[PDB]
């Protein structure tokens, strides 16, 4: 006699086998009024206006193909489809693949002059059907899909010269992309970066492969660790309309400002402003100074001129420039003006309006909140996401501001579904006539389509009723999102609370940590994850805290750990734990901490702190000392590890130096052997230091797994392993 | 009141005293304290060098070495370990008759091997893979070889696989008995593939180093070998030394082969043994110096073949010959018709040898040979394969055999080794168990005891206070055949009680884990403090009991020796004092393989286990060892069984057990690879297990801190498996 009360919980197997599936609604805008979507592997076009859809491409159209198709891309003009197959993953964004082009009009595979195997990147021009691709680190252009390619670059060289694609650090830390090609708006020009890794040292590590491989392979990747020789970069623009089968193409170089050339620098943003005007942002290796150049094509010479009178400097006295890099400009149609996110006088990030000829910009938004991103710009309105609503830095809503009157700001998303929806992202149609809103929480995700004309809702695309239906009699956890005041400053936390949460009781507490610069772990997003299991099934509170160095609340918080990683952010997690115990529903003897990546570092620094607050913790793929990690991320926050810069704090902020203090705690250290990002080295050095002072700890290596430890089997194994460790640390049967 | 603790084991609270002498003549020996010479006669000892004669040397002296004539001492410093035996060092020579360091024409830094000639004070050494000879310590050295090249050509020193698996040594230099000739081998690793692994080094090193070592895994291209002899009495300052090659016999040059033994017979006769890559066929060459030629000749009529139809040849390699004084006769250990290893007497000029020992037991080694007597160690006494005693056989009558050690102290002493003086007039006996080690000195003329050198009374006194475990050594019968086991039994062993049991396994070919040796080790702690029985069992494949048992796993690694550890454990649970809910198993090296194969067997006998630096599949291990037992991993040889004998293939069965897998990341021997493939296989079938890597540790995991950490980590694991707080 169970009286239909909820007795199921969200189990580990539920998490690992995806029993409860979040439904997405992924679409790709092709025009201002149409998008594509998949239904049972068929590709449908949907017309946003009248809600209808015709099948665009049958699920069976490439049955005969003979290869499994990984992805596709349709040309802007709708006449060709690019089919990607033989996908082989490289780093976070990079991969190689084979490509075939299918003619949608003639309904046939192009068979002549095919894109080669092992292609590294492919991109349609933004209009028409020109193709640029990179193969063997060289850029090629096809003006028509069945015609011979024009080789643009001849300097490409494996691990040394990269044309049109990024090297390792630029991929992971600057562009968040493999691609380093930018077509001009109408496809006349093709801009590209060339990276030179010639004297960049190699990280070398073993890759064991299938058990058939008799001798392990040594992988060798150019990787600048902090203070090491960095890649250099050059920027070019080629006119694709004046290509020629008989003469090699002329790439016009756009050189960095002298203020950048006097030392090590980076190329940190590329943005076309018009058909004949491109903006570049460069960044000094000491990343507190950046320069935007605005460069016009000179018709009579066929070269590019960046007028000093249109240079813009963005700098910071309290930290680095930008959240992770200088923000990108959104240009007006005429290219004489642009909008960009920068920190205001009070350290808050807001949209500034620039004319290209003027040094002073004027802020169009302000307040003790921040603009997350500029999402679209029309002639009358600018659309942006911000955390203004209710002063909740972990919320996200879409707003629009009238360009002619800045006091006219409308929230488009705030009141749509206030209880269910407080974390929005947006996808606008090609000229902003429609937009898809994606609400990610705190309720179940919700995908809606809107006409921007008068912001009326057209329809619900996906409302996750199937999941809602399944969860009716499952004892799910809740999320408390709130703040504590420390030194007259709000710091936000979230708690994943077990079902039937009773403040009278004392719960074990797991502190789930990132805490890196501009991190945010206290937000309104709904998640089905390991923490859901721990709270639901194992009755553990899983909490996260955004202390100093956290993002989206201004520079006085975010920049507080400048040049001082492994200090305040570490201390604030410990303090968070003390505060959580102060709240009266936490068992002080069963507080644990875990993190991945920066969170691994913090977890480790906390467990080695001697605080006595934490019984145990898990560090997954942690940084152990900053000199081991890449230059652009590390130096952003730490400067250079030289006696004249910041070597002392590099040396003071290691987990190894704290080995002795791990005698007080139970520690599990986990690392993938093929981690190209945070090298296995980092954990190898932790383990060696703990061994050297005689502290027992648990370890797990993951053969051939990288930073994501994301293989289906490894992912299940690591979470199972961590679950056993936590349960035993907390004496849960 | 107290027990033998883990800290006791880890910190060496209770030390075993050795007595390590080094003979200088037929009646004198050195010993450390200070360095005394001792008389074998009287035991009177005048000092040779004061504890700090080298007070103002400045360098920490690793080891010393006196020239045979006593005129010079060689000081070794700046020791840096390479592999198991190999190392690099700096060297200085001190004139004893003048009392001063030689300062001219010194031995280079990073010298790889140095050796005195067997008489006088000639010196040969290896530096940058080339051989140099010094006639006098202060004079310039003559360069013998010019082909030495790092990782590629090795003159007078072994490459990785020859060091580890053939010679158990770095040196490949062999002086003739009076020092006239210097014989040397030359190895060529040119097409041997490289094992590559990361070395993380000190925290200060920003980018890991990639260590690369030529290492032939099973079936890979092997090193090639050449053998040379040079006359050191006709070296020139003007002309280059002329090294005479001795080529391997035509029966070996037909394919891949190995040089497996070098034994000088006389001043002008050298014996070489060669082994085919398929190691069931070896040939001994006897080569004589020709004065008018200046050449060495090995008559095909003097070739002696040793082969096996049931396995490989030798225990780990063909045995060494012991030539009579005139060098026309020799004695060596070979398998007889019944498959037992016994001493055969060969005449240089003929095919048939005659066995001078016989029976169902084995000769372990020929220890010394005189005109009247051959001295040897065997396990004959009481039919106990795990005992060892010294015997002498009257050369004029083989039926006259005296056991010299059996009856000296039968209770305390059943495991002897021996060190004879230069002409076998005196000998030191070393008893290693079952009681406390006992070192005694004896005169061979009448095999009388002279004196106790070390009796470990100091250790005996300390142990009085400690609840020490006992050893049971006994056998069981499987298929009308005896298989021996030993058990470390906790103190106050109550056979009406049910004890947890840990099976300690090696179980490799020619292994022996059941013996009469006394040990203070991890098992002592587990027995004394944790009341765990620690058992070992010598099944099929095990050694010193004849070929029928040893060759039983020929071409079939990971079969019978694995089943027999399982069957042993079953038998132990039927002994009534074993808790069958708490049986574990662990092992290192081959024992990690077997442990892993056992735990993946699905037998249900074992709750848990620990594999340390295990082999996971035979293609990952070196060619010399692996192929000895497995042949080649090719379709026409033994590929199928290479494929059938992996621990990865048993991954699914690890669901029934708790496994701890441990490996050093700089293991040059069993590559970290092997455990990496185990862990991946267990991950891929969703088996949870425990792991531990040891950063920059090698196959020994022998760094002081790492040693303590692994045993501590393992102890927690077994205690938790056994529900011991
Ligand atoms: C990439 O950068 C390297 C420098 O790291 C350039 O190599 C130098 O080239 C100049 C002129 O040819 C020489 O004087 C230097 O000696 C070179 N230095 C080296 C090889 O370390 C190289 O030219 C660059 N390559 C490209 C294609 O831009
Ligand atoms: C072996 O190396 C040592 C140390 O590097 C040598 O001694 C050094 O010799 C240099 C001259 O080359 C002097 O400047 C140093 O003062 C010496 N250092 C020390 C610590 O002694 C030594 O001479 C080298 N070679 C031999 C044959 O001994
Ligand atoms: C060591 O072995 C290598 C590999 O067999 C020998 O190298 C060959 O030498 C011959 C004649 O000099 C060349 O024609 C081949 O091309 C070489 N092969 C290589 C390098 O792979 C080498 O001669 C041997 N060295 C010694 C000292 O015995
Ligand atoms: C002893 O032999 C060596 C090695 O062949 C000779 O040294 C080489 O001589 C050749 C040319 O004659 C050079 O190309 C080599 O580079 C030399 N050195 C080495 C280390 O290979 C040496 O000349 C010979 N000595 C005498 C006295 O004949
Ligand atoms: C937890 N977490 C993330 O989810 C994403 C991260 N970065 C942010 C900067 C841009 C990308 N490189 C992704 N980082 C930063 C980081 C810090 C380290 F110390 C070591 C490794 C990473 C990494 N991937 C994180 O920590
Ligand atoms: C337990 N144990 C030993 O104590 C000594 C061993 N060898 C015997 C042959 C000569 C030397 N290589 C020492 N072996 C053999 C072995 C087998 C493996 F499968 C993997 C690795 C080793 C190794 N060192 C052992 O197993
Ligand atoms: C939607 O409806 C209109 C009818 O006016 C039609 O012309 C258009 O092609 C339709 N699009 C579809 C079904 O995708
Ligand atoms: C790519 O791969 C396969 C061969 O493995 C072949 O069928 C195809 O023609 C290759 N080359 C190109 C240019 O596609
Ligand atoms: C283009 O450049 C390459 C290399 O610089 C050269 O070999 C090739 O001949 C050139 N082609 C033309 C048409 O100039
Ligand atoms: C693209 O832009 C360029 C530069 O303004 C211009 O010359 C060209 O006419 C444009 N092409 C098309 C097809 O609109
Ligand atoms: C940039 O950083 C360096 C080192 O921290 C500092 O000396 C310099 O003044 C900074 N620049 C600005 C504009 O704050
Ligand atoms: C021991 O005594 C003898 C007796 O004369 C003496 O000749 C010898 O040198 C001594 N040996 C040692 C090592 O003291
Ligand atoms: C050493 O043996 C060699 C070769 O037999 C011989 O020529 C030489 O005379 C011997 N030397 C001495 C001093 O015995
Ligand atoms: C050596 O081994 C091979 C392969 O097992 C076998 O065929 C051959 O007969 C053996 N040789 C001898 C002499 O037994």
Q: Any alpha helices (H) in B279-352, and if so which ranges?
A: none
Q: What is the DSSP string of A281-345?
A: EEEESSTTEEEEEEEEEETTTTEEEE-GGG-EEEE-SSS-SSSSSPPPPEE-TTSSEEEEEEE-T
CA distances, B19 to each of A34, A248, B35, B407, B440 (Å)? 91, 83, 13, 22, 9
Q: What is the CA radius of gyration of chain A?
A: 26
Residue A361, token pair as written in the block? 């910009």
Spell out the SS3 assignment of B429-464.
Answer: EEECCECCCEEEEEECCCCEEEEEEECCHHHHHHHH
The size of chain B, in residues, is 725
Distance CA A311, CA A257 (A): 9
CB B692 within 8 A of CB B721: no
Residue B480, token pair as written in the block? 């009308």
Which of A304, A295, A352, A309 lies closest to A328, judged by CA?
Answer: A352
State whether the Cα torsion A716-A722-A723-A724 is positive or negative: positive
Query: A165 in helix, strand or coil?
Result: strand
Beta partners for A28? Answer: A36
Q: Exposure string (b/e) for A249-276, b if CB count within 10 Å is 16 or more?
A: bebbebebbeebeeebbbbbbbbbbbeb
Task: Tell me if residue A721 is catalytic.
Answer: no
DSSP H or E segment with residue B165: helix B160-165
Query: A158 in helix, strand or coil?
Result: coil
CB A11 within 8 A of CB A533: yes
Residue A6, token pair as written in the block? 């909820």
Distance CA B707, CA B701 (A): 6
Nearest to B648 among A211, A687, A701 (CB): A211
CB A673 within 8 A of CB A643: no
Nearest to A203 among B207, B220, B705 (CB): B207
Distance CA B71, CA A249 (A): 81
CA distances, A450 to each of A211, A264, A441, A456 (Å)? 53, 46, 19, 6
- Pick the last residue of a domain from A415, A445, A475: A475
Residue B478, token pair as written in the block? 């499987």
Are residues B192 and B68 located together in one domain of the fold?
A: yes
**Which of ligand 1's atoms lies nearest the C-alpha of A157?**
27
Task: Tell me if residue B667 is catalytic.
Answer: yes
Beta partners for B447? Answer: none
CA distances, B366 to each of A554, A695, B223, B358 (Å)? 84, 48, 30, 14
Name, in order, each residue with C-beta under 8 angstroms of B88's C-beta and a sequence gap of 6 or more.
Answer: B78, B79, B80, B82, B110, B111, B112
Query: A272 in helix, strand or coil?
Result: strand
Distance CA A50, CA A603 (A): 53
Query: What's the maximum distance between 2 C-alpha atoms anywhere in chain A?
Result: 88
Distance CA A8, CA B291 (A): 95
Residue A584, token pair as written in the block? 């009266």
CA distances, B100 to each of B71, B73, B386, B509 (Å)? 12, 10, 49, 51
- Give the closest ligand to the alpha carbon of residue B84: 6
Are residues A424 and A572 located together in one domain of the fold?
A: no
Counting Cα atoms < 13 Å in the Cβ hemisphere of B455 gives 7
Burial class (CB within 10 angstroms; exposed 0-12, middle 13-18, buried 19+) of B291: exposed
Distance CA A253, CA A134 (A): 19
Which of A84, A15, A32, A21 lies closest to A427, judged by CA?
Answer: A32
Distance CA B193, CA A45 (A): 56
- Give the closest ligand to the alpha carbon of residue B613: 6
Distance CA A376, CA A385 (A): 10
Name, in order, each residue with C-beta under 8 angstroms of B53's C-beta and a sequence gap of 6 or more.
Answer: none
Burial class (CB within 10 angstroms; exposed 0-12, middle 13-18, buried 19+) of B77: middle
Q: Exposure string (b/e) for B627-648, b if CB count within 10 Å is 16 or more?
A: bbbbbbbeeebbbebbeebbbb
Residue A462, token pair as written in the block? 């996906």
What CATH number does the domain containing A288 carry?
A: 2.140.10.30
Name, in order, each residue with C-beta under 8 angstroms of B58's C-beta and a sequence gap of 6 or more.
Answer: none
Which of A18, A25, A10, A19 lies closest to A439, judged by CA?
Answer: A25
DSSP A85: E
Are residues A86 and A39 located together in one domain of the fold?
A: yes
Distance CA B696, CA B693 (A): 9
Instruction: Please state the separation of Cα B608 from the chain's center in Å.
Output: 30
Q: What are phi and psi of B343, to 5 degrees?
A: -80, 125
Residue of B205, B655, B673 for testing the chain A interface, max A β-carbons within 10 Å:
B673
Residue B239, token pair as written in the block? 């002309």
CB A548 within 8 A of CB A40: no
Residue B71, token pair as written in the block? 């005129």
Are residues A398 and A504 located together in one domain of the fold?
A: no
Are residues B575 and B461 located together in one domain of the fold?
A: no
CA distances, A201 to each of A10, A222, A227, A703 (Å)? 47, 6, 11, 24
Give me the number of domains chain A comprises: 2
**CA B318 – ligand 13 centroid, Å:** 30
Distance CA A314, CA A326 (A): 8
- Pick the last residue of a domain from B452, B467, B482: B467
Instruction: Please state the separation of Cα A478 from the chain's center in Å.
Output: 27
Are residues B425 and B574 located together in one domain of the fold?
A: no
In this structure, the strands spanning A381-386 and A371-377 are: antiparallel
Name, in order, each residue with C-beta under 8 angstroms of A342's C-beta and a sequence gap of 6 or more.
Answer: A314, A327, A349, A350, A352, A361
CB B609 within 8 A of CB B522: no
- Pick the last residue of a domain from B467, B501, B524: B467
- The nearest alpha carbon in chain B to A712 belongs to B684
Domain hosting A80: range is 1-475
Q: How far is B673 from chain A (nearest CA, A)?
A: 6
Residues from chain A that touch B196, judged by Cβ atoms under 8 A, are: 206, 215-216, 218
Residues from chain B that touch A680, judged by Cβ atoms under 8 A, are: 198
Q: Tell me, in Å, the resolution of the deposited structure.
A: 2.2
**Which among B405, B589, B601, B623 is annotated as catalytic?**
B589
Q: Ligand 6 pocket, B160 CB below 6 A? A: no
Instruction: Please state the separation of Cα B473 from the chain's center in Å.
Output: 23
CA distances, A652 to each of A320, A565, A602, A625, B289 (Å)? 21, 10, 14, 9, 69
Residues from chain A that touch B688, judged by Cβ atoms under 8 A, are: 717, 720-721, 724
Are residues A444 and A383 located together in one domain of the fold?
A: yes
Burial class (CB within 10 angstroms; exposed 0-12, middle 13-18, buried 19+) of B716: middle
Distance CA B100, CA B461 (A): 44
Distance CA A308, CA A324 (A): 26
Are residues B213 and B332 located together in one domain of the fold?
A: yes
Could you count the other beta carbons within 10 Å of the beta carbon of residue B57?
14
Q: What is the DSSP string of B559-570?
A: SHHHHHHHHHHH
3-state helix, strand, coil in chain B (%, to 5): 20, 35, 45
Are residues A460 and A503 located together in one domain of the fold?
A: no
Question: Using what technique was this structure determined?
Answer: X-ray
Which of B158, B178, B150, B155 lies closest to B241, judged by CA?
Answer: B155
CB A241 within 8 A of CB A204: no
Are residues A625 and A707 located together in one domain of the fold?
A: yes
Distance CA A57, CA A73 (A): 12
State whether the Cα torsion B680-B683-B687-B691 is positive or negative: positive
CB B523 within 8 A of CB B531: no
Counting Cα atoms < 13 Å in the Cβ hemisphere of B696 gives 21
Interface of B with A in 647-706 (CB under 8 A): 648, 665, 671-673, 676-677, 679-681, 683-684, 686, 688, 690-696, 705-706
Residue B28, token pair as written in the block? 């004198």
Distance CA A361, CA A354 (A): 5
What CATH number does the domain containing A609 carry?
A: 3.40.50.1820
Q: What is the DSSP string of B170-232?
A: SB-EEE-TTSSEEEEEEEE-TTPPEEEEEE--STT-SS-EEEEEE--BTTSPPPEEEEEEEET
Q: Exposure string (b/e) for A82-111, b if CB count within 10 Å is 16 or more?
A: bbbbeeeeebbbbbbbbbbbbebeeeeebe
Beta partners for B23? Answer: B29
Name, in order, each residue with C-beta under 8 angstroms of A39's C-beta and a sequence gap of 6 or more.
Answer: none
CA distances, B155 to each of A613, B162, B489, B668 (Å)? 61, 13, 50, 22
Distance CA A124, CA A131 (A): 5
Cis before B434? omega within 30? yes
CB B582 within 8 A of CB B573: no
Are residues B504 and B423 located together in one domain of the fold?
A: no
DSSP H or E segment with residue A610: none
- Give the closest ligand to the alpha carbon of residue B618: 6
Instruction: Please state the separation of Cα B517 from the chain's center in Å.
Output: 16
In this structure, the strands spanning A330-331 and B448-454 are: unpaired
Are residues A513 and A470 located together in one domain of the fold?
A: no
Distance CA B45, CA A296 (A): 97
Q: What is the DSSP string of A423-486?
A: BEEEEE-TTSSEEEEEE--BSS-EEEEEETTTTEEEEEEE--HHHHHHGGGEE--EEEEEEEEE
CA distances, A64 to each of A60, A145, A486 (Å)? 8, 21, 65
Nearest to B208 among A681, A717, A724 (CB): A681
């Amino acid at each position: 006699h169970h009286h239909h009360h909820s007795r199921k919980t969200y189990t580990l197997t539920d998490y690992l086998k995806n029993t409860y599936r979040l439904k997405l609604y992924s679409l790709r805008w092709i025009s201002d009024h149409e998008y594509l979507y998949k239904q049972e592997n068929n590709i449908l076009v949907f017309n946003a206006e009248y809600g209808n859809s015709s099948v665009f491409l049958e699920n069976s159209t490439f049955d005969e193909f003979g290869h499994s198709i990984n992805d596709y891309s349709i040309s802007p003009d709708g006449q060709f489809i690019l089919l990607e197959y033989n996908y082989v993953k490289q780093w976070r964004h990079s991969y190689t693949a084979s490509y075939d082009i299918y003619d949608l009009n003639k309904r046939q595979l192009i068979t002549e002059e095919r894109i080669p195997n092992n292609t590294q990147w492919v991109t349609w021009s933004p209009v028409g059907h020109k193709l640029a691709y990179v193969w063997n680190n060289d850029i090629y252009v096809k003006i028509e899909p069945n015609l011979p390619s024009y080789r643009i670059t001849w300097t490409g060289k494996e691990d040394i010269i990269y044309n049109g694609i990024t090297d390792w650090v630029y991929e992971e830390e600057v562009f968040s992309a493999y691609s380093a090609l930018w077509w001009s708006p109408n496809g006349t020009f093709l801009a590209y970066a060339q990276f030179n890794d010639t004297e960049v040292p190699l990280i070398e590590y073993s890759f064991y492969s299938d058990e058939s491989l008799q001798y392990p392979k040594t992988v060798r990747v150019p990787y600048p660790k902090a203070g090491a020789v960095n890649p250099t970069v050059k920027f070019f623009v080629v006119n694709t309309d004046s290509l020629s089968s008989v003469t090699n193409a002329t790439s016009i170089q756009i050189t960095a400002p002298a203020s950048m050339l006097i030392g090590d620098h980076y190329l940190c943003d590329v943005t076309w402003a018009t058909q004949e005007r491109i903006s570049l942002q460069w960044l000094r290796r000491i990343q507190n100074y950046s320069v935007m150049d605005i460069c016009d094509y000179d018709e009579s010479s066929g070269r590019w001129n960046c007028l000093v009178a249109r240079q813009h400097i963005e700098m910071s006295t309290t930290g680095w420039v930008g959240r992770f890099r200088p923000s990108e400009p959104h240009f007006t149609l005429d290219g004489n003006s642009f909008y960009k996110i920068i920190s205001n006088e009070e350290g808050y990030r807001h949209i500034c309006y620039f004319q290209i000829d003027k040094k002073d910009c004027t802020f169009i938004t302000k307040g003790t909140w921040e603009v997350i991103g500029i999402e679209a710009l029309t002639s009358d309105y600018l659309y942006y996401i911000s955390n203004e609503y209710k002063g909740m830095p972990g919320g996200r809503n879409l707003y629009k501001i009238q360009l002619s009157d800045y006091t006219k700001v409308t929230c488009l998303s705030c009141e749509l579904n206030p209880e269910r929806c407080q974390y929005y992202s947006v996808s606008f149609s090609k000229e902003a006539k429609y937009y898809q809103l994606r609400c990610s929480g705190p309720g179940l995700p919700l995908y809606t389509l809107h006409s921007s004309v008068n912001d009326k809702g057209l329809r619900v695309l996906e409302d996750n009723s199937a999941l809602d239906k399944m969860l009716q009699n499952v004892q799910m956890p809740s999320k408390k999102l709130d703040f504590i005041i420390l030194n007259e400053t709000k710091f936000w936390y979230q708690m994943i609370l077990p079902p039937h949460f009773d403040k009278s009781k004392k719960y074990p507490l797991l502190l789930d940590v990132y805490a890196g610069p501009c991190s945010q772990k206290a937000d309104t997003v709904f998640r089905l994850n390991w923490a859901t299991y721990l709270a639901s099934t194992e009755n553990i509170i899983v909490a996260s805290f955004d202390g100093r160095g956290s993002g989206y609340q201004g520079d006085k918080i975010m920049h507080a750990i400048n040049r001082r990683l492994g200090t305040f952010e570490v201390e604030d997690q410990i303090e968070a734990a003390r505060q959580f115990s102060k709240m009266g529903f936490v068992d002080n003897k069963r507080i644990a901490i875990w993190g991945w990546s920066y969170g691994g570092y913090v977890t480790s620094m906390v467990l080695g702190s001697g605080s006595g607050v934490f019984k145990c913790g898990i560090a997954v793929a942690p940084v152990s000392r900053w000199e081991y990690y890449d230059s652009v991320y590390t130096e952003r926050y730490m400067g250079l590890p030289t006696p004249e810069d910041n070597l002392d704090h590099y040396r003071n902020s290691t987990v190894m130096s704290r080995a002795e203090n791990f005698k007080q705690v139970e520690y599990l250290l986990i690392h993938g052997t093929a981690d190209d990002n945070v090298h296995f080295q980092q954990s190898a050095q932790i383990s060696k230091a703990l061994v050297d002072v005689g502290v027992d700890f648990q370890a797990m290596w993951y053969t051939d797994e990288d930073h994501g430890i994301a293989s289906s089997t490894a992912h299940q194994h690591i979470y199972t392993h961590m679950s056993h460790f936590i349960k035993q640390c907390f004496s849960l049967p």
